[PDB]
Amino acid sequence: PWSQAETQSAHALFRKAYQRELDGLLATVQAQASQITQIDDLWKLHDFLSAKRHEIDGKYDDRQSVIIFVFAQLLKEGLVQAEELTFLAADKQSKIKALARL
Amino acid sequence: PWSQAETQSAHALFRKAYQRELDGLLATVQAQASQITQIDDLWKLHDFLSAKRHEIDGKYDDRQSVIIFVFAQLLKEGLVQAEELTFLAADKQSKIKALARL
After folding, report:
1. Cβ pair B41, B35 in contact under 8 A
2. Shortest CB distance from A26 goes to which of B25, B39, B50?
3. Long-range contacts of B73-77 (CB under 8 A, 24+ apart)
4. Separation between Cα atoms, residue B49 and residue B44, nearest integer Å
5. Among A5, B10, B79, B89, whose Cα sits 20 to 30 Å from the Cα of A32?
6. What keywords appear on the UniProt entry (chains A, B)?
């Protein structure tokens, strides 16, 4: 069961994390592109973008089946802070933190 | 049909052109990367890499039955100059310059 308030603030937090992931992605790309010397470095970068882009396209799934798992992943990846989950029910917060610890 | 020196000097220019395209590909990527401002710029870079890597994968066919068409494409693209084809038989040069206009 998800309240209106929970679903709405979760969406806002998804977008926030999404923007954080863009910033990180850009920084790494911008970095390992300036560190290029060999050409295979350029193909490694290409492979990285291809992969990270496909990951992101489907990472922010708001469906009831995985939405809890998604937050755990975001938390583990540092894309959201635990303090940003306090709009959720206590049981959801605990479950998320737990999954992310492992 | 094909001189032994023709074949050597052909494989050479062929490989010299490959290294020229890489030089230009690398220069463009490093430039695009360091000049990113929006996130869409990053997606453009990705699409550009995707396209060129494909184009390149199947452009450089070293096989004797095709080498003439490749040189034409390279000449048409500006990756080699007509002046660099003088080591070939007169009939081979003309053939190439003709195919380039297709």
Report:
1. yes
2. B39
3. B73/B100, B74/B17, B75/B100, B76/B100, B76/B101
4. 9
5. B79
6. Membrane, Thylakoid
B25-B79-B91 Cα angle (round to 5): 155
Chain A hits for B60, CB-CB cut-off 8 Å, are none
Between A40-57 and B4-34, two packed helices, what is the crossing angle to 10 degrees? 50
Angle of CA points A6, A9, A11, to nearest 5°: 105
SS3 of A10-43: the string is HHHHHHHHHHHHHHHHHHHHHHHHHCCCCCHHHH
Is the distance from CB of B68 to CB of B53 less than 8 angstroms? no
Disruptive mutation site among A30, A32, A35, A56 for chain B (greatest number of B CBs within 10 Å): A30
| Method for structure elucidation | X-ray
What is the DSSP secondary structure assignment for residue B79, as one 8-state letter?
Answer: S
- Token pair for B55: 């184009």
